[PDB]
Ligand binder design. Structure first.
Ligand SMILES: [Cl-]
Length: 51
């Protein structure tokens, strides 16, 4: 389960764009201590919820 700081950073990124690119995702992964793959799936899943 995501920590609060991880979810906060993920939502801040999503609020800038629903389609963050791989460079943005990788920078997030490094900063927040998750893999880029986990973060990528989170964005896919949040886009599916939005649609
Ligand atoms: Cl991947």
């Amino acid at each position: 389960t995501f920590t609060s700081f991880q979810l906060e950073e993920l939502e801040k990124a999503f609020s800038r764009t629903h389609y963050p690119d791989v460079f943005t995702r990788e920078e997030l992964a490094m900063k927040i201590g998750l893999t880029e793959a986990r973060i990528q799936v989170w964005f896919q899943n949040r886009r599916a919820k939005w649609r």
